Amino acid sequence: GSGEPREEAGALGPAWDESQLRSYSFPTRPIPRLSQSDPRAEELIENEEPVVLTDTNLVYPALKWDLEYLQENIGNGDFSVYSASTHKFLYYDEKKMANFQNFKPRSNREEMKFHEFVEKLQDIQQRGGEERLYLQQTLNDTVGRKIVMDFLGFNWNWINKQQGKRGWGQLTSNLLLIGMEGNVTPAHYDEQQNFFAQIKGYKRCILFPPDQFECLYPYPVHHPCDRQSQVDFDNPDYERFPNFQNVVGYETVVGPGDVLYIPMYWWHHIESLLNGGITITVNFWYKGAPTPKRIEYPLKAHQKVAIMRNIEKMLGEALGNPQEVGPLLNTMIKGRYN
Amino acid sequence: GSGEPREEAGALGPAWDESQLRSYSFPTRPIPRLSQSDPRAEELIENEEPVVLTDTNLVYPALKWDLEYLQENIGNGDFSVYSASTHKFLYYDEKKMANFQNFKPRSNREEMKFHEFVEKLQDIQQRGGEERLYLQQTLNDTVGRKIVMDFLGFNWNWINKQQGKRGWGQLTSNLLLIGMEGNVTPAHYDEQQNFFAQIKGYKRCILFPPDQFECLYPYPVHHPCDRQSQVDFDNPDYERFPNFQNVVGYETVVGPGDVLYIPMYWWHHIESLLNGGITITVNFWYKGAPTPKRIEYPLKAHQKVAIMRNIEKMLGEALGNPQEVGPLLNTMIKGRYN
Amino acid sequence: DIAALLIAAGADVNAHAKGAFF
Amino acid sequence: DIAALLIAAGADVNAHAKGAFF
Ligand SMILES: O=C(O)CNC(=O)C(=O)O
Ligand SMILES: O=C(O)CNC(=O)C(=O)O
Ligand SMILES: [Zn+2]
Ligand SMILES: [Zn+2]
Numbered sequence: 001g002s003g004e005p006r007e008e009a010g011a012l013g014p015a016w017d018e019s020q021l022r023s024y025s026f027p028t029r030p031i032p033r034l035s036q037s038d039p040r041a042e043e044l045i046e047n048e049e050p051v052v053l054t055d056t057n058l059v060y061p062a063l064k065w066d067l068e069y070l071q072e073n074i075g076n077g078d079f080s081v082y083s084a085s086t087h088k089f090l091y092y093d094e095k096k097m098a099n100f101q102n103f104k105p106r107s108n109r110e111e112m113k114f115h116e117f118v119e120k121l122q123d124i125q126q127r128g129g130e131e132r133l134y135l136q137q138t139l140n141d142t143v144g145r146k147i148v149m150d151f152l153g154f155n156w157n158w159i160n161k162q163q164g165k166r167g168w169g170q171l172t173s174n175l176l177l178i179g180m181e182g183n184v185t186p187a188h189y190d191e192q193q194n195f196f197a198q199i200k201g202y203k204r205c206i207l208f209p210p211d212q213f214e215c216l217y218p219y220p221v222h223h224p225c226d227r228q229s230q231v232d233f234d235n236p237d238y239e240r241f242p243n244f245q246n247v248v249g250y251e252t253v254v255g256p257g258d259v260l261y262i263p264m265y266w267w268h269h270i271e272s273l274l275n276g277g278i279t280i281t282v283n284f285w286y287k288g289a290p291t292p293k294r295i296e297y298p299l300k301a302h303q304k305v306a307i308m309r310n311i312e313k314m315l316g317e318a319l320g321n322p323q324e325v326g327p328l329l330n331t332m333i334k335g336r337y338n
Numbered sequence: 339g340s341g342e343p344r345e346e347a348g349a350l351g352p353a354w355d356e357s358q359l360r361s362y363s364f365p366t367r368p369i370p371r372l373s374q375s376d377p378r379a380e381e382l383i384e385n386e387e388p389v390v391l392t393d394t395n396l397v398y399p400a401l402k403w404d405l406e407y408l409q410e411n412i413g414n415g416d417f418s419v420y421s422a423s424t425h426k427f428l429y430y431d432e433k434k435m436a437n438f439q440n441f442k443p444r445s446n447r448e449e450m451k452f453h454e455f456v457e458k459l460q461d462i463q464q465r466g467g468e469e470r471l472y473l474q475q476t477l478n479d480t481v482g483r484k485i486v487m488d489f490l491g492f493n494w495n496w497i498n499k500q501q502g503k504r505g506w507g508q509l510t511s512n513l514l515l516i517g518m519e520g521n522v523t524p525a526h527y528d529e530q531q532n533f534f535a536q537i538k539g540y541k542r543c544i545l546f547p548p549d550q551f552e553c554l555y556p557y558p559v560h561h562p563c564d565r566q567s568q569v570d571f572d573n574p575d576y577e578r579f580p581n582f583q584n585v586v587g588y589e590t591v592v593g594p595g596d597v598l599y600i601p602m603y604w605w606h607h608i609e610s611l612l613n614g615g616i617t618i619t620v621n622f623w624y625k626g627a628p629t630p631k632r633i634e635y636p637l638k639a640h641q642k643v644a645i646m647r648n649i650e651k652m653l654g655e656a657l658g659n660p661q662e663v664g665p666l667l668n669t670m671i672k673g674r675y676n
Numbered sequence: 677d678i679a680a681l682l683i684a685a686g687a688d689v690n691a692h693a694k695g696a697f698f
Numbered sequence: 699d700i701a702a703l704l705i706a707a708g709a710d711v712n713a714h715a716k717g718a719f720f
Contacts, residue, residue: 080714091712109714140717151719172709173716190711217673227710230673241673264707287709295701297658307656307704308670311649318645318682320635326675332646333671335555335568335579337664418692429690447692478695489697510687511694528689565688602685625687633679645682656704 001028001251002204015255016202020273022184024233025244028206031252031260036158045166048263048302050207052252056259059197059282061153063256066200067118067178067278075144078111079137081120087184088234089134092224099222099322107134121180121278134185135178139282159195159284168193169287177281179272187216187229187269189305192285194262198254201272201279205260206249208267211301213308215243216267221312222322233269264288265302339366339589340542353593354540358611360522362571363582366544369590369598374496383504386601386640388545390590394597397535397620399491401594404538405456405516405616413482416449417475419458425522426572427472430562437560437660445472459518459616472523473516477620497533497622506531507625515619517610525554525567525607527643530623532600536592539610539617543598544587546605549639551646553581554605559650560660571607602626603640 005014033052034041044051082089084107092105112120117135124131139151151174163171172192181201187208196205208216217240219225231241238245253273254260262268272279299307315329316322343352371390372379382389420427422445430443450458455473462469477489489512501509510530519539525546534543546554555578557563569579576583591611592598600606610617637645653667654660 093710094714136713138713138715138717140719171718173711173713174719175713185712188712191708192711214669214672220674227712243673285711285713288707291702291705291707295705299657299705303705304657304666304669306707307653308666309708310704310706311653311670314678314682315645315649318679319637319642320679326671328642328646329667329671329675331552331642332649333664333667334552335581336558337667431688432692474691476691476693476695478697509696511689511691512697513691523690526690529686530689565690623689623691626685629680629683629685633683637683641683644685647686648682648684652700652704656701658701 001030001206001249002253003030005253006255016253016273016276020202020276021204022234022271022274024206025236026247026249028249028251031205031207031250033252033258042165045162045261050250050263050266051261052254053259053261054257056155056158057257058155058159058195058259058284059199060155060257061150062197062199062280062282065150065280067121070147071115071118073144073146074114075142075147076113077140077142079114079117079135081110081112081117082107082134082136083110084108084132084134085130087132087182088186089132089183090186090225091188091228093226094224096222096224096226100224103224105224117178132180132183134180134183135176137176138173139176162195163286166193167289169289172285172287175283175285177279177283179279181272181276181278182274183279184271185269187231187233187267188227189218189265189267190227190262190285191264191288193264193288194286195284196254196260196262197282197284198256198258198260199280199282200256200277202253202255202276203279203281204251204253204271204273205262206251206269207262208247208249209301210265210267210305212247212267213301213305215241215247217241217244220322220325221309222316222325229267265305339368339544339587340591341368343591344593354591354611354614358540358614359542360572360609360612362544363574364585364587366587366589369543369545369588371590371596380503383500383599386604388588388601388604389599390592391597391599392595394493394496395595396493396497396533396597396622397537398493398595399488400535400537400618400620403488403618405459408485409453409456411482411484412452413480413485414451415478415480417452417455417473419448419450419455420445420472420474421448422446422470422472423468425470425520426524427470427521428524428563429526429566431564432562434560434562434564438562441562443562455516470518470521472518472521473514475514476511477514500533501624504531505627507627510623510625513621513623515617515621517617519610519614519616520612521617522609523607525569525571525605526565527556527603527605528565528600528623529602529626531602531626532624533622534592534598534600535620535622536594536596536598537618537620538594538615540591540593540614541617541619542589542591542609542611543600544589544607545600546585546587547639548603548605548643550585550605551639551643553579553585555579555582558660558663559647560654560663567605603643
């Protein structure tokens with residue numbers, strides 16, 4: 001998956017090599033890399049399948065971004081920075097932690113100024129620490145004037161046309177992601193459509209279609225890690241997660257200037273290449289198109305995912321306590337549906 | 339369970355003996371037998387627990403009913419009569435049979451005149467056949483005038499006061515049940531409140547509270563045998579139904595003049611005593627009181643049964659096909675809740 | 677209310693034809 | 699419609715604070 005590494009212009013050699021990639025238990029095949037002018041690319045997006053677009057110019061102004069530029073221009077607002085002693089930055093919803101007092105996150109969020117993030121990064125490097133940092137902060141009007149100008153220069157013409165053709169709802173947020181080499185965001189699915197715009201460095205993206213729900217074992221809806229896979233990709237527990245032996249991914253490596261369409265409900269695992277330096281990415285999250293007036297049968301996989309989420313949500317509310325959802329589901333199926 | 343057989347008045351001896359009862363795998367304890375004037379009886383009904391009331395006079399006019407009287411007076415309408423070559427008359431909903439083309443009922447319903455039922459009964463006896471008949475027909479205005487007069491003479495004063503004190507909805511139907519000795523209605527639960535009025539012969543009634551759902555394994559909601567237990571009480575399959583080894587029943591034997599309160603959602607297994615002659619029973623089904631305005635937590639067992647039924651109903655409708663309910667539930671729980 | 681919706685009882689019983697007497 | 703109710707999508711994503719840019 002992801003094919004042979006591409007050759008950089010001006011005979012600069014391959015951007016990356018196979019050694020930089022982590023080793024996993026499942027096979028993959030490549031995500032198509034296409035021009036935004038290619039009819040096959042529009043067909044893939046229309047059919048809610050992933051595609052890497054190589055020439056959108058979506059974040060062209062941001063390609064000059066590095067830590068010095070951003071530090072000097074992004075202003076004095078607060079940035080959410082996760083810290084961990086593991087390469088894995090498993091996302092968790094802090095509001096759901098009261099449901100699950102036994103959950104102890106491996107990563108911690110700290111709010112800091114951008115120059116504080118840069119200094120903490122520099123200090124880790126100089127002392128050779130094992131601590132890892134991932135900055136994950138949605139962009140807003142508080143950024144300095146030059147970042148505002150860079151944002152205004154994104155290819156709104158192209159992406160606004162996509163939003164309109166696909167019948168999507170509003171752009172809800174743009175997440176700025178700055179990670180250290182080797183950082184991993186573990187497999188999960190998002191409930192919005194995503195154009196994932198790579199700015200600096202290289203990220204390996206492994207996607208799984210919504211019909212692999214049965215192989216990826218999301219946490220309960222009420223758990224802080226709702227929408228994230230329970231499977232440890234580095235040591236999969238096949239006794240608890242037997243259908244993870246049947247997973248099949250779609251993979252690619254995106255670099256500066258590439259844009260990956262991550263369709264809504266598609267699982268994705270994202271890793272900053274080993275020994276590849278820091279990585280910078282900005283995503284574009286859009287609400288999905290409304291539920292159709294006439295529902296067509298048989299349902300699509302993502303529609304059954306939506307039903308399952310809603311059953312879990314309804315039961316938590318009706319039982320008055322999320323902890324009772326599991327026992328009630330088990331009572332319903334044992335000796336009656338299994 | 340059911341204690342020592344009661345002694346009939348006038349030194350007529352015990353009504354029945356232990357040999358007449360079928361042998362089952364679980365223990366039981368007796369249902370209380372009380373006067374309708376006893377405050378403990380009102381307390382049990384108010385708390386939706388079973389009680390046998392010995393002196394209600396609820397169906398006093400009907401105590402003279404036998405096959406000759408009914409044949410001569412019940413008129414010329416049609417009566418539903420089930421036939422089987424087994425003692426077990428497992429109920430099934432004929433409308434749900436299209437969902438489950440693999441279901442082949444062991445009993446068959448035939449519509450016939452009452453004199454035709456009596457003749458068929460007599461013919462079985464004379465030839466010593468093994469065929470069994472169970473007449474199960476809701477009473478209505480079509481019955482002859484003397485049965486109307488007998489119905490009017492039921493103790494409406496007493497039962498109307500019960501309906502009012504308990505906040506029940508309307509009387510929906512009165513089912514006339516006439517069975518052969520040894521007939522069994524297998525364990526099930528009804529969604530209405532029931533005063534079960536015994537007229538002729540003796541019936542052993544074994545009840546299980548709603549919190550034994552986990553031990554009695556009802557069929558799927560969409561299956562013709564919705565609300566009936568899947569467990570064969572005469573040969574329980576503990577590999578499929580392991581918690582049937584934990585069932586505990588409440589039992590009694592009702593005879594002429596007795597009235598058993600079978601609370602809504604309570605499982606009941608009812609058998610006409612072996613070698614006891616034909617049995618006649620008339621029940622009184624009332625809709626339950628409306629759902630409370632303020633739901634109190636933690637929920638009662640019958641409220642969780644109601645939730646489970648509604649989840650199954652909703653999923654069948656949303657998926658467009660009842661056969662998909664099981665696979666979706668299994669997908670929801672495997673490796674996530676079990 | 678979702679809780680009220682889900683706790684709502686049905687009224688099914690073991691009888692093929694139901695009817696009041698009058 | 700019960701089908702429409704149950705197929706309704708949410709909008710959750712992996713971000714602690716969400717906001718549009720303007
Ligand atoms: O880039 C990452 O590490 C994680 N990104 C996402 O999950 C996303 O943009 O939806
Ligand atoms: O009497 C029988 O055989 C069956 N009766 C019932 O299930 C009932 O009245 O609710
Ligand atoms: Zn994501
Ligand atoms: Zn019943």
